[PDB]
Amino acid sequence: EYPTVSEIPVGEVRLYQIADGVWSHIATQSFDGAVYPSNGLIVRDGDELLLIDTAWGAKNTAALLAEIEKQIGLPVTRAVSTHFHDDRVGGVDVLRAAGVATYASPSTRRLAEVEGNEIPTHSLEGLSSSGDAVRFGPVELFYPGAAHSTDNLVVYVPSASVLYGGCAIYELSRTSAGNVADADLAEWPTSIERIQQHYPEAQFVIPGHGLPGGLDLLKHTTNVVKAHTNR
Numbered sequence: 766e767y768p769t770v771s772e773i774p775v776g777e778v779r780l781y782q783i784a785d786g787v788w789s790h791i792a793t794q795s796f797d798g799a800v801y802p803s804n805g806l807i808v809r810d811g812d813e814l815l816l817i818d819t820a821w822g823a824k825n826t827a828a829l830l831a832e833i834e835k836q837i838g839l840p841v842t843r844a845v846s847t848h849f850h851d852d853r854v855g856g857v858d859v860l861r862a863a864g865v866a867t868y869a870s871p872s873t874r875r876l877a878e879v880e881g882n883e884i885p886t887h888s889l890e891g892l893s894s895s896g897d898a899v900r901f902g903p904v905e906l907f908y909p910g911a912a913h914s915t916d917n918l919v920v921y922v923p924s925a926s927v928l929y930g931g932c933a934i935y936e937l938s939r940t941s942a943g944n945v946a947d948a949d950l951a952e953w954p955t956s957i958e959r960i961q962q963h964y965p966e967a968q969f970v971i972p973g974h975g976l977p978g979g980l981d982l983l984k985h986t987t988n989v990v991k992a993h994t995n996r
């Protein structure tokens with residue numbers, strides 16, 4: 766089955782195939798006094814691999830490349846980051862050391878600078894507006910307006926109808942929006958509908974923290990963020 770947070774010690778990384786040549790990676794990190802899981806994506810780009818989001822910090826991101834060479838054996842050559850929180854750019858510096866071309870949105874790149882996290886080298890052009898999308902390697906990058914954070918992207922793999930939600934989609938088991946400091950609640954619901962519009966065929970949805978699902982996840986996220994307001 767899928768990995769849960771308890772099964773993964775801090776600083777180990779597991780890979781979970783989703784469709785052909787599309788894995789996800791799970792690892793665990795501690796934020797204040799707990800240890801949460803986080804998810805990322807791995808996609809085959811011809812003879813190289815494209816990494817959607819770091820593990821969650823340097824040590825983990827290190828083990829990720831370790832796992833990948835063991836399990837996949839193709840090299841990770843580029844890497845795109847969903848937003849600026851440590852669970853997405855923690856380990857950039859390691860990747861860049863490991864020879865991996867690190868990419869990210871401009872907005873995201875600035876927000877990382879300001880908040881003092883690692884900063885991906887290259888800027889992603891033409892994702893600046895709501896609904897924009899640019900085709901990066903074997904995936905489409907899509908910007909759907911503010912949600913979990915004003916910059917958050919999502920990643921669709923057209924070949925496999927996989928949609929990478931990033932921290933902007935929750936899981937079912939998750940019910941409490943909870944920590945929403947840098948999150949624009951007022952726009953998020955629309956922003957998810959922007960997704961359900963553009964990627965409506967999507968037959969594999971993946972959140973930033975937890976077990977995958979289908980297009981149901983979107984709707985479950987809207988409610989959960991809705992009832993953050995009326996309660």
Ligand SMILES: C=CCCn1c(C)cnc1C(=O)O
Pocket residue numbers: 796801802850852913932933944973974
């Ligand atoms: C399960 C995550 C709780 C809040 N959080 C952390 C610590 C990192 N990312 C998030 C999130 O909500 O996306």
Ligand SMILES: [Zn+2]
Pocket residue numbers: 848850913914932
């Ligand atoms: Zn985040």
Ligand SMILES: [Zn+2]
Pocket residue numbers: 803850852932973974
């Ligand atoms: Zn997160």
